[PDB]
Amino acid sequence: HMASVDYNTRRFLSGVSELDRSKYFNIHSTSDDDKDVGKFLADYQVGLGRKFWGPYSYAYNKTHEVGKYPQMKPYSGNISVKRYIATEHPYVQHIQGGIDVQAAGAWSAEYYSNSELVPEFFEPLNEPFVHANDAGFTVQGQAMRELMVDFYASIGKHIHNNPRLNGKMKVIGYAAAYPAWEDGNFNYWNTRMKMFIDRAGAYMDGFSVHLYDGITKRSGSNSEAVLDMVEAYSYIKFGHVKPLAISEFGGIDNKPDDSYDDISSVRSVSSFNHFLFNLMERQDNLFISIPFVSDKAEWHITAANNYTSYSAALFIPDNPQNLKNTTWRLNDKKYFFELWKNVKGERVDITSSNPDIQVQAFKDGGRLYIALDNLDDNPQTVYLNNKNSWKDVSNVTKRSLYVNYNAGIEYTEQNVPSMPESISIVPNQTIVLVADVSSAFTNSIIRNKYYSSEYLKPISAGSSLSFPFTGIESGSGRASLRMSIGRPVSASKKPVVKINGTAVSVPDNWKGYGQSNRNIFFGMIEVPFDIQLLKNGDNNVDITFSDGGGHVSSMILQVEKYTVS
Ligand SMILES: *[C@@]1(O[C@@H]2[C@@H](O)[C@@H](O)O[C@H](CO)[C@@H]2O)O[C@@H](COS(=O)(=O)O)[C@@H](O[C@@H]2O[C@H](CO)[C@H](O)[C@H](O[C@@H]3O[C@H]4CO[C@@H]([C@@H]3O)[C@@H]4O[C@@H]3O[C@H](CO)[C@H](O)[C@H](O[C@@H]4O[C@@H](COS(=O)(=O)O)[C@@H](O)[C@@H](O)[C@@H]4O)[C@H]3O)[C@H]2O)[C@@H](O)[C@@H]1O
Ligand SMILES: [Ca+2]
Ligand SMILES: [Cl-]
Ligand SMILES: [K+]
Ligand SMILES: [K+]
Numbered sequence: 001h002m003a004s005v006d007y008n009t010r011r012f013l014s015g016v017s018e019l020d021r022s023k024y025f026n027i028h029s030t031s032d033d034d035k036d037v038g039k040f041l042a043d044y045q046v047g048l049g050r051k052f053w054g055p056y057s058y059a060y061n062k063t064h065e066v067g068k069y070p071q072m073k074p075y076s077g078n079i080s081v082k083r084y085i086a087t088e089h090p091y092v093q094h095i096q097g098g099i100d101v102q103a104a105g106a107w108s109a110e111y112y113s114n115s116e117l118v119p120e121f122f123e124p125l126n127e128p129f130v131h132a133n134d135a136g137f138t139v140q141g142q143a144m145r146e147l148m149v150d151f152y153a154s155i156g157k158h159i160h161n162n163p164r165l166n167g168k169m170k171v172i173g174y175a176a177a178y179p180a181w182e183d184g185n186f187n188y189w190n191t192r193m194k195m196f197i198d199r200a201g202a203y204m205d206g207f208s209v210h211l212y213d214g215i216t217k218r219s220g221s222n223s224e225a226v227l228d229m230v231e232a233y234s235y236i237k238f239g240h241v242k243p244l245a246i247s248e249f250g251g252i253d254n255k256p257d258d259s260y261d262d263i264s265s266v267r268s269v270s271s272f273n274h275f276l277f278n279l280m281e282r283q284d285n286l287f288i289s290i291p292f293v294s295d296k297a298e299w300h301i302t303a304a305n306n307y308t309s310y311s312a313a314l315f316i317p318d319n320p321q322n323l324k325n326t327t328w329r330l331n332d333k334k335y336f337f338e339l340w341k342n343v344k345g346e347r348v349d350i351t352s353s354n355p356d357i358q359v360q361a362f363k364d365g366g367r368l369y370i371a372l373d374n375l376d377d378n379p380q381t382v383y384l385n386n387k388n389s390w391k392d393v394s395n396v397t398k399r400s401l402y403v404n405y406n407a408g409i410e411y412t413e414q415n416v417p418s419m420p421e422s423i424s425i426v427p428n429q430t431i432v433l434v435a436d437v438s439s440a441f442t443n444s445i446i447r448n449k450y451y452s453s454e455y456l457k458p459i460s461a462g463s464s465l466s467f468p469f470t471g472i473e474s475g476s477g478r479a480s481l482r483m484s485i486g487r488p489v490s491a492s493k494k495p496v497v498k499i500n501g502t503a504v505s506v507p508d509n510w511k512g513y514g515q516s517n518r519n520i521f522f523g524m525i526e527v528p529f530d531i532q533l534l535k536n537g538d539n540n541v542d543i544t545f546s547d548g549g550g551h552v553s554s555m556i557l558q559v560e561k562y563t564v565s
Contacts, residue, residue: 001354001381001382001383002384003382003383003384004351004385005348005370005385006350006386007348007361007363007368007392007393008440009348009441009442009444009445009562010349010441010444010445011346011350011446012445012447012563013284014449015284017444018345019283019344021047021343023286023287023288024276024289025337025340026049026288026289026291027046027048028050028248028290028292029051029295030048030049030051030084032048037314040315040330040334044337045342047083048083049083049084050084050085050086051085052087052089052126054086055069055088055107055112056088056093056104056107057089059107067096069103069107072111075115077116079115079116079118079165079168080118081118082117082120084120084121085119085247085290086123087125087175087247088125088126089126090128090131090134090148092136095147097144097147098139099151101150101154104154105151105153105157105158106154108122108158109165112159112162112165113164113165120169120170121172121245121287121288122169122170123171123172123175123247124155124171125173125175127176127210128145128148129145129176129192130178132145142191145195146195146199149174149196149200152173153200155171155203156171156173156202156203156205160203170206170287171203171205172204172205172206172208172245172247173200173207173208174193175209175210176193176208179209179226180522181226181229181553182551183520186456186551189229189553193207197234197237204242205243206287207230207245208246208247209227209230209246209247210247210249211223211250211275212249212251213274214252214254215251215254215267215405216517217274217513219275219375219512220375220523221511221524222515223275224524225486225522225524225553225554226522227244228524229484229553229554231556232451232452232553232554233455235451241285243286244287245286245288246275246288246290249275249292250268250291251267251270252268253311257305257308259308260308260316263407265312265313266409268312269332270403270428273339274358274373275289293314293333294313296315296317297310297313298323300313314333315329316329316331335409335411339432343432343434344364344369345365345367346363347360348363348368349361349445350370351478355375355509355511355526356380356509356511357375357376357380358372358375358511363437368435368437369432369433370384370432371432371433372425373429373431374426374427375513376427376513379426379427381422381423381424382424384420384423390418392437393438394437394438395436396415396419397413397414397416397435398413398415398431399411399431399433399434400413400430401430402429405428420433444562444564445477445561446560447559448559449556449557449558450469450470450539450557452469452541452555454466454467454555455552455554456553456554458550458551459545459547459551462545462546463544464544465543465552466541467542469538470538472534473559473561474534474559474561475559475563476532476562477559478559479531479560481497481527481529482526483495483497484524484525484555485521485522485550486520486522487551488520488521489515489516489518489519489521492545493521495545497527497542499529499541500533500534501540501542504529504533505529507525507528510526531561534557543555
């Protein structure tokens with residue numbers, strides 16, 4: 001396996017090259033007013049964030065009745081924007097059968113437009129649909145999912161029609177907990193996220209989902225397919241993608257309760273890394289992402305919980321029964337942020353021959369950062385190639401974060417005397433190489449994605465499926481097809497694939513695991529091919545499976561084209 005870095009070629013994801021740290025290196029908190037958390041944020045260069053508080057928790061606190069809103073103290077001064085996501089629990093205190101949805105929406109706009117400081121993102125209800133059958137709701141099931149979507153729609157409509165908020169606050173939804181698009185032969189997609197996009201999507205600035213590994217893995221090809229489907233349908237519906245927001249990502253350890261444990265609760269860090277590389281490659285269509293690691297989470301530390309900390313906590317009190325006076329310990333989740341500290345700059349060109357080895361590279365003035373992650377279940381040796389034999393690179397330091405499920409995190413920083421010829425990387429290990437670079441850019445390469453008017457197509461044995469694409473700027477560089485399929489695990493993953501009539505090789509491998517422990521495979525399989533097969537303008541992809549069943553969920557062409565600028 002090989003990875004190649006060209007630090008003399010600047011890389012763009014459509015219009016952006018620079019890494020936006022604020023899209024990634026965040027905690028699931030807004031506790032920057034805590035002395036310990038605030039110091040951590042500065043020390044590790046971390047942003048915010050997410051909070052369960054908003055117009056509906058504020059209003060209920062005043063009126064003690066769902067769907068009834070107080071008067072907001074009038075305020076007509078400047079509105080500043082704090083970068084975080086405000087969300088609400090999908091409680092009966094916030095939404096209920098019989099609610100006046102237009103009044104609820106009006107209230108969000110009244111609450112925020114009379115505030116001196118608003119969140120950059122409002123995500124009205126957290127994981128709403130999984131709560132649609134909760135006993136306390138007087139409307140349940142599909143009717144409640146529809147009411148929750150109408151609540152979202154009203155909020156987006158009212159916020160956007162308020163000139164004090166429009167352009168300042170972005171409304172995102174639906175904070176999806178369980179992005180099992182494929183369930184029920186894609187009935188789940190049709191009745192959850194498709195329905196959301198159809199019924200509230202016009203009023204949303206972007207679409208939000210939660211991405212978790214069980215410790216059943218979404219990292220790798222499943223999460224890629226999950227997010228590609230949202231983009232692919234948004235293109236069809238709106239004529240363009242809308243940005244994504246990954247309002248939680250991490251791991252869930254499968255534990256009889258949600259209490260923190262020093263070994264089990266750090267297993268999530270490997271998931272942070274595995275998802276991060278996916279999301280870095282989406283920066284041009286990503287508002288924000290939030291690693292699911294929080295703060296002191298003092299709300300959890302109660303008699304009823306035996307004074308345990310919450311699993312997602314970042315700080316653990318030395319004395320849980322004296323919270324007023326206790327010292328607080330920063331746990332080993334800190335090493336996720338240590339690994340990525342100072343990493344920034346313009347993307348530079350990088351490729352990896354093995355889809356299980358995720359690669360990133362950035363150049364910030366005289367510093368070069370090269371990152372690798374192993375999604376496979378075996379160690380892999382990766383040959384590192386550079387066309388200039390690294391002549392301009394010196395003072396190499398290797399950072400390594402290895403998550404072992406029994407031993408916890410092993411984090412090391414080592415000076416090495418030259419860029420390595422090859423690197424061995426074990427499962428759940430992420431490496432960041434930091435070096436000085438003295439070089440200037442002689443070329444750029446621009447990654448664009450092209451979406452089809454066709455999506456969600458049922459597969460029949462021997463029956464070709466045609467996917468048209470338009471507006472392609474072809475040229476020199478690289479290209480690939482992102483082919484997402486949901487099929488029984490035994491169904492073929494090796495269709496015949498033709499690019500403008502020319503058959504191309506379909507790889508055996510894809511990002512991450514085989515999903516053998518799932519009944520339905522739902523994943524994006526990349527099919528690299530020669531860019532020279534693409535034409536300027538219209539292109540067609542035709543694919544044929546030898547067996548029936550399942551669907552092609554989305555087909556997206558990725559083109560990385562050499563460009564001046
Ligand atoms: C979610 O869980 C995840 C799922 O979404 C999903 O993805 O699966 C995941 C598996 O990994 C997971 O289950 O996120 C969690 C986040 O954890 S955290 O980041 O560690 O916190 C949990 O969310 C937490 O849920 C708890 C309850 O279970 C709680 O709601 C947490 O938030 C806290 O709530 C209270 C207590 O501490 C503060 C936290 O935000 C907050 O304090 C309130 O703050 C407001 C101001 O913002 C007020 O001060 C309020 O005081 C009251 O109101 C004031 C007046 O205020 S106002 O004028 O109305 O504005 C006064 O009247 C005062 O007297 C009064 O007491 C104060 O309480 C939350 O983060 C999971 O539960 C969640 O599902
Ligand atoms: Ca693989
Ligand atoms: Cl659901
Ligand atoms: K605020
Ligand atoms: K969902």
